[PDB]
Write a protein that binds this DNA or RNA. Structure first.
Ligand SMILES: [Mg+2]
Ligand SMILES: [Mg+2]
Ligand SMILES: [Mg+2]
Ligand SMILES: [Mg+2]
Ligand SMILES: [Mg+2]
Ligand SMILES: [Mg+2]
Ligand SMILES: [Mg+2]
Ligand SMILES: [Mg+2]
Ligand SMILES: [Mg+2]
Ligand SMILES: [Mg+2]
Ligand SMILES: [Mg+2]
Ligand SMILES: [Mg+2]
Ligand SMILES: [Mg+2]
Ligand SMILES: [Mg+2]
Ligand SMILES: [Mg+2]
Ligand SMILES: [Mg+2]
Ligand SMILES: [Mg+2]
Ligand SMILES: [Mg+2]
Lengths: 176, 123, 209, 45
RNA sequence: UGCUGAAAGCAUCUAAGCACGAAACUUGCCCCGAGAUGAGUUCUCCCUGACCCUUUAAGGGUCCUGAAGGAACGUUGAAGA
RNA sequence: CGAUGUCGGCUCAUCACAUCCUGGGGCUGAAGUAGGUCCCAAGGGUAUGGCUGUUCGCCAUUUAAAGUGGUACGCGAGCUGGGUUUAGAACGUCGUGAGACAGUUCGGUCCCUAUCUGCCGUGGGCGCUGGAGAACUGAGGGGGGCUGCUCCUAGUACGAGA
RNA sequence: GUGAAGAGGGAAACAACCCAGACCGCCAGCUAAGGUCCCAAAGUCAUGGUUAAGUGGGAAACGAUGUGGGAAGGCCCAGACAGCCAGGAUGUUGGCUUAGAAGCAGCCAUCAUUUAAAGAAAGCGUAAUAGCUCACUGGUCGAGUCGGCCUGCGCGGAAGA
C-alpha cells in the first residue's frame, strides 16, 4: 500500500502496453508479459504507472502492492536486467557452460547437466563461479536456486553451491 | 538340502565330527541351505584335542549334499552324504587347515578359495 | 507392435556352443492373414483383425464366410484383434509371418491355461493343511474359519475359497526369444508358456523391459 | 522442527524468529538458526 | 524444500502468481468386464404367400411357409461334479 | 438363565494407525559410518526354536523388520482339548465329621445331512424392440505392489586416525 | 411432569424430550411444536449486518498481525514505526570469587569519565585477544505508527478400527 501508492517511472525506451489485466513491457533488454490480479486496476499516464484497488475486491490494496512491485522489476528487467552469481566450494566442484547448459561436477558419480530456460543466460568466469543474467526476476531466482539445490552448503566446511551473497555458518563437530 | 535339525559330517580337520544345523542363514524364513550356503551349527561330536568342542556354536559352509547340484546343461552331481566345513563365526573363514573329500566348483566363492585348493578332488 | 497368433507345439531344449542348455517352448506361427482393418472413422480405434490356420468348409457358418469373403482370405481356426500404434498400417488380406519377431528380444505369451477342475483351497490357494493326526476330525484339507464372528456376520467378498482352477487366460511376460524361422514357421521362446499342447497362443512383443 | 500447541515461547527463542501462516498452520520460521522452527497443528485428518 | 511477492516501506513459500516433492492416490502391468436395463460399436448372414373373426388394436385366430442359425443324436477332449 | 460354549493352540483371516521394516522430510549435543527426536506415509513385508497349557515372558539363533491394537479378549453347527467347573484317587492345610481349598497332583465321552442371508465356483431363463454368427470398445471390479547381500563410483567425500 | 395405561405432529430412526389428549364419517378451513433450494408440504421471501472455517455439520487447558464493531491511550513534520547509512567510545586488558577472563561461567556490587549516544552489559561464541550484531544516539526517508481494554464471527489445539 505504501508500495502500491508509489508510482514507477517508465524510462525513455520502454514501451508499456495494456489490455485489461494483461500487461506487456518491451525494452532494450527483452519483453515480459504479466497478467495482473483481477482486483488490481493499473493506469498509465504521464511516463508512469500507478496502482490502486478496484471496487468490490476485498484485498485490492494487497493485490495492488504485489502488482506495483512486479512491474517495477519487469521494467528493471528489460532495461538494466538481473544478475545472480553462485559459486562452488569444495574440492573437485567445477562448472562450465556450453551453449545453454551448465555442467556441474559436484562429487557425484554422474556429472550433472542443467538445462536453462528461455531468458536466462549463463557464464562461468572461473571453474567455480556461475553468473546468471536475465530479465525475469522470478526466473533467475528459480534457476539460481535449482542450481544451489544440487548441493546445499554444508555446515561443517561450507562445501557446496552457494549464492555469492550468501552467509554460511559452519559449526564444530560433536566432541568425540 | 539342509535345514534345522539336519546333521552333517565334516570335511575338515577342525576336530568336529558331527554337527547339527540350527539356522539356515541368508533371509527371513529361509528354508534350505545348499552347497556354498552358510548355516549355523552346534557341535554334537568332537575328537579329544581339536580346535572345537562339543556344544560349541558356530557357522559352517555346506560343500556336499545328497540333493546335489544342477549344472547349466542339466547334469546333476550328488553325494552319498551331507557335509560342511566349519568357519569362525565372525571371520567366516575356515578353522581347519585341511579339507577332505571332493568338493564342487560352486565354491569358487572367493572366500572359500582356500577350500578348493586344499580340496583333494573338485567336481 | 502388433503380435501374432500361434499354436503351442511342445517343449524341448537347445544346447549352446558352450554348454548351456536352454529350455524352449516351440510355438507354431503360420502366416497370420488380415481379415479386417479398423480405423478411427469407422470404428473409433485402429487395430487389425487376423485369422491364421484353416477350417472345415462344412464347419464354416454362413456369416463367417461372408466375413472372410469380404477380405478375400480363407477361413481360419479363429479371429483375433491387435491394436495399432499410429503409423502402423496394414491392408486387408495382407499376410504377416513370424519374421516380425526377428529382432524383438522378448515377448509376452498368452494362453488358455490347463484346466484342473474344481480344486480345493490347498492346491488352489496354497492353503496350509491342518493336522494329519493329533486328533483332527475330518478336517485335514478344509479351509478353516472363513470369517470372524457377529461382527461383521458375513464373509467378505473375495474370500479365497475352493472352486474352478485353470482353463483361464494367463499371460507370461518377458520371455527371451531364442529362435525365429519362417521357413519352418517356428518361434522358440525360453521357458514355459500357458496351456496344453495344441492350443492357440498369442505372442506379442513384450510390453515391459 | 518441533510441533507445539503454543508458540509464546518458541517465537522468542531468537531475534530472527518470525511466525508466519503458511497454508493454514502457523509456522515459526528462523532461517539462520533453524533448530528453533516450530508449528502449531499437524495437517488435516 | 523453494522462487517471485504483497497486506506490513523491512521480512514473508502464499494472500494473487510460480518450480519441486514419497512405496500412499490416479495411471502404467495381469485378470474379469455391455444385465454398462446408460443393455454400446464394427463385420457378416437369413426371412419378400394368403385367409377368417371381434371388442378394430402394437387385437385374436387359421391355412400355407419353417431360413440364418441354434440345438439335438453320435464319436470324443491335456474341457469337466 | 424355556442356553449367546470358557483360556491357549491350529486353520483362516479382515480393519485402525497411536508405523516395526522399507519410502519421503525437519532438527540434532548430525564429521563420516552409525545414531537420537519429530513430521508425512498404511503399498507391501513383518522369525524358527529350548521351557511351560499358556497368552505372555526368559533363553538360543535368525531378520530389513520380528510393529501396537479393533474384530463376541476375530475364528469350536471349522479342527484341537493341553489349561479351566462334573463325577475316581491322593498330598498338604482346614474341619469332631460329612466334606472343603480361590492349593498341588494322577485319570477323566467335544453332535448337528445347510432352508435363508453371506461367500467360492457353475449353469438355466428373459431381456437389450426382425432374427442370427462373430470380433470388439471398456463404464466399472479385481489381482499385483516385500526386501537382502556383493560389485563399481571408491578405499573416493569425510575423517588425526580407525 | 411424561411413559407406564396415550394414538396424532416434531426431534432422520428414537416408551419417558417439544407440540398435543384420538366417539365416528369428510377429496373443506385455521393453527401448535417444527418447518418453507431438491428428495419433501410451505419464502431460492424482503431488509441490515457477520463468517470463508463447508466453521455451520463433534471437543479443553493454552496458542496466534484471522477478521467485524466500540471506547480510551503512547510516540510523531522539534520528523515517530520499519528499513538503510553511521557510530556503539574511556576509567578499563575491569578489580576481584575459582586454574584463564580482557563485560566473557559464578557471587558481590552496578560506579565512573569523552560525547551524538554507548550497558563494570545484551547473548552467539570462546586459549587470551577475539573478530560478529545489538541496547542507546547522529543521518536518510516522509506520515503515520505502537499494543493494552470491551465485544462479534471465525483459526489451531482434533488420532480408531
Ligand atoms: Mg482339465
Ligand atoms: Mg468324533
Ligand atoms: Mg481324520
Ligand atoms: Mg462361531
Ligand atoms: Mg449387517
Ligand atoms: Mg503446501
Ligand atoms: Mg431361544
Ligand atoms: Mg500418522
Ligand atoms: Mg529401500
Ligand atoms: Mg513348536
Ligand atoms: Mg527335546
Ligand atoms: Mg474369544
Ligand atoms: Mg465339533
Ligand atoms: Mg472410457
Ligand atoms: Mg417419524
Ligand atoms: Mg379425546
Ligand atoms: Mg416443496
Ligand atoms: Mg527509524
Amino acid at each position: 500500500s505504501r508500495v502500491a501508492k508509489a508510482p514507477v517511472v517508465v524510462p525513455a525506451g520502454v514501451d508499456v502496453k495494456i489490455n485489461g489485466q494483461v500487461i506487456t513491457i518491451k525494452g532494450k533488454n527483452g519483453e515480459l508479459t504479466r497478467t495482473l490480479n483481477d482486483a488490481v486496476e493499473v493506469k498509465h499516464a504521464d511516463n508512469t504507472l500507478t496502482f490502486g484497488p478496484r471496487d468490490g475486491y476485498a484485498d485490492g490494496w494487497a493485490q495492488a502492492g504485489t502488482a506495483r512491485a512486479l512491474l517495477n522489476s519487469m521494467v528493471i528487467g528489460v532495461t538494466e536486467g538481473f544478475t545472480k552469481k553462485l559459486q562452488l566450494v569444495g574440492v573437485g566442484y567445477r562448472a562450465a557452460v556450453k551453449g545453454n547448459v551448465i555442467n556441474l561436477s559436484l562429487g557425484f558419480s554422474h556429472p550433472v547437466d542443467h538445462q536453462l530456460p528461455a531468458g536466462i543466460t549463463a557464464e562461468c568466469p572461473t571453474q567455480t563461479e556461475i553468473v546468471l543474467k536475465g530479465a525475469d526476476k522470478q526466473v533467475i531466482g528459480q534457476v539460481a536456486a535449482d542450481l544451489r539445490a544440487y548441493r546445499r552448503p554444508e555446515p561443517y566446511k561450507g562445501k557446496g553451491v552457494r549464492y555469492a551473497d550468501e552467509v554460511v555458518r559452519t559449526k564444530e563437530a560433536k566432541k568425540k | 538340502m539342509i535345514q534345522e535339525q539336519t546333521m552333517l559330517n565334516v570335511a575338515d580337520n577342525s576336530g568336529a565330527r558331527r554337527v547339527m544345523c540350527i539356522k539356515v542363514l541368508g533371509g527371513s524364513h529361509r528354508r534350505y541351505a545348499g552347497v556354498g550356503d552358510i548355516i549355523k551349527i552346534t557341535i554334537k561330536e568332537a575328537i579329544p584335542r581339536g580346535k572345537v568342542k562339543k556344544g560349541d556354536v558356530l557357522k559352517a559352509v555346506v560343500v556336499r549334499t545328497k540333493k546335489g547340484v544342477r549344472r547349466p546343461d542339466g547334469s546333476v552331481i550328488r553325494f552319498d552324504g551331507n557335509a560342511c566345513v566349519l568357519l569362525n563365526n565372525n571371520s567366516e573363514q575356515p578353522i581347519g587347515t585341511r579339507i577332505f573329500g571332493p568338493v564342487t566348483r560352486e565354491l569358487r566363492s572367493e572366500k572359500f578359495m582356500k577350500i578348493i585348493s586344499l580340496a583333494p578332488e573338485v567336481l | 507392435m502388433i503380435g501374432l497368433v500361434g499354436k503351442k507345439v511342445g517343449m524341448t531344449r537347445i544346447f549352446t556352443e558352450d554348454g548351456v542348455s536352454i529350455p524352449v517352448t516351440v510355438i507354431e506361427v503360420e502366416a497370420n492373414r488380415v481379415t479386417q482393418v479398423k480405423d478411427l472413422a469407422n470404428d473409433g480405434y485402429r487395430a487389425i483383425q487376423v485369422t491364421t490356420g484353416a477350417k472345415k468348409a462344412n464347419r464354416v457358418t454362413k456369416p463367417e464366410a461372408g466375413h472372410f469373403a469380404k477380405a478375400g482370405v480363407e477361413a481360419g481356426r479363429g479371429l483375433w484383434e491387435f491394436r495399432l500404434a499410429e503409423g502402423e498400417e496394414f491392408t486387408v488380406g495382407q499376410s504377416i509371418s513370424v519374421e516380425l519377431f526377428a529382432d524383438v528380444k522378448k515377448v509376452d505369451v498368452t494362453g488358455t491355461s490347463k484346466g484342473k477342475g474344481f480344486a480345493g483351497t490347498v492346491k488352489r490357494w496354497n492353503f496350509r493343511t491342518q493336522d494329519a493326526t493329533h486328533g483332527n476330525s475330518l478336517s485335514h484339507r478344509v479351509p478353516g474359519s472363513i470369517g470372524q464372528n457377529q461382527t461383521p456376520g458375513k464373509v467378505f467378498k473375495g474370500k479365497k475359497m475352493a472352486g474352478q482352477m485353470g482353463n483361464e487366460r494367463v499371460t507370461v511376460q518377458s520371455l527371451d526369444v531364442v529362435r525365429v524361422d519362417a521357413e519352418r514357421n517356428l518361434l522358440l521362446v525360453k521357458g514355459a508358456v500357458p496351456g496344453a499342447t495344441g492350443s492357440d497362443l498369442i505372442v506379442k512383443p513384450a510390453v515391459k523391459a | 522442527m518441533k510441533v507445539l500447541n503454543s508458540l509464546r515461547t518458541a517465537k522468542e527463542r531468537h531475534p530472527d524468529c518470525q511466525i508466519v501462516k503458511r497454508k493454514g498452520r502457523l509456522y515459526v520460521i528462523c532461517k539462520s538458526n533453524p533448530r528453533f522452527k516450530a508449528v502449531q497443528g499437524r495437517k488435516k485428518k
